[PDB]
Amino acid sequence: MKVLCYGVRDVELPIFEACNKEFGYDIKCVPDYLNTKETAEMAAGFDAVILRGNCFANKQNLDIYKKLGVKYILTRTAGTDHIDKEYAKELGFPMAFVPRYSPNAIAELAVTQAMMLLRHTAYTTSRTAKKNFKVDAFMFSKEVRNCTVGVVGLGRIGRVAAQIFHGMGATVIGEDVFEIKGIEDYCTQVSLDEVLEKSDIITIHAPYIKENGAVVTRDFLKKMKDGAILVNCARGQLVDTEAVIEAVESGKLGGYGCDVLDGEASVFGKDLEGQKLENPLFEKLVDLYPRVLITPHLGSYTDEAVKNMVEVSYQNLKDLAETGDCPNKIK
Numbered sequence: 241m242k243v244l245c246y247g248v249r250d251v252e253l254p255i256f257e258a259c260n261k262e263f264g265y266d267i268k269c270v271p272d273y274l275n276t277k278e279t280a281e282m283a284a285g286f287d288a289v290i291l292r293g294n295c296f297a298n299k300q301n302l303d304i305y306k307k308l309g310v311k312y313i314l315t316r317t318a319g320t321d322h323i324d325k326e327y328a329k330e331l332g333f334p335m336a337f338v339p340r341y342s343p344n345a346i347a348e349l350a351v352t353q354a355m356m357l358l359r360h361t362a363y364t365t366s367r368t369a370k371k372n373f374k375v376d377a378f379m380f381s382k383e384v385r386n387c388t389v390g391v392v393g394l395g396r397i398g399r400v401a402a403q404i405f406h407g408m409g410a411t412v413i414g415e416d417v418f419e420i421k422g423i424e425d426y427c428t429q430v431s432l433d434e435v436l437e438k439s440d441i442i443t444i445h446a447p448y449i450k451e452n453g454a455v456v457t458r459d460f461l462k463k464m465k466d467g468a469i470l471v472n473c474a475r476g477q478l479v480d481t482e483a484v485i486e487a488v489e490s491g492k493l494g495g496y497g498c499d500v501l502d503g504e505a506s507v508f509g510k511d512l513e514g515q516k517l518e519n520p521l522f523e524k525l526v527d528l529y530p531r532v533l534i535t536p537h538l539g540s541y542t543d544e545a546v547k548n549m550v551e552v553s554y555q556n557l558k559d560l561a562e563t564g565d566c567p568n569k570i571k
Contacts, residue, residue, distance in 0.1 A: 243286065245267060248271055306333075397474075413429070441470075461492055
């Protein structure tokens, strides 16, 4: 079984190899993502591809895969919007994804951003890096053990974020569209309005539902505590970026941390130092550092998460090859 793996970072190579010990696949890893015709043509000779984010399995590239006789299309991700699933089905491609991997990978990043803001360590160290060791009023901080933390979205990631903040001593509350059972030892489930009213820190872990639109709107922000912290390591489209910028400029938000942005593909992964950013919202967000912190979608960039993503993907391929089916088959 010959498997082409796209978007393979050199740091990921040992994981692809180690996880392959129990599978024996004939793997090839390339750094290229799936975009141009020529990236799709790289799959000549291969039985399966393992895509990741930003690997566009669109009509053009799926037609090329069919012509080339690719049998299985996998993505090592929880997200599948980069694949045109309806067209893939029309062409008969069996596909699989990775709905579940390290929730702590994302949750710890959310927590670390939140603390960098709550305890003003990004602000402080941005200053000391420049030999400014002065102490100012903005630097004065709360303790997270004396805070209420609000989790918006109590899925797998959200629950782990709540557990972690609870373990640091916070009082945690949270909101979800459904009744979330078994969280009572670490989180009280309440209304969104109660989360907004009471939270010193808010972290977003809800799914993006296109018909709902952004969850973090002007009206969401308006109900928050002045000086509260907001963190979005979920999805860019959950927040109205402009509205957040305005809440940071007004002081409604003490700080904003994000690992994702609405339109992030224009900047993430690129070194644009010295350039005017094409999206003026992104230019503003960068200018607001260190009261806005941006990480380029690293929430799943841990050793455990990547191991999980690669190992589930290998298992998914084996399931598909042996049975035509898999627990994570894209529906």
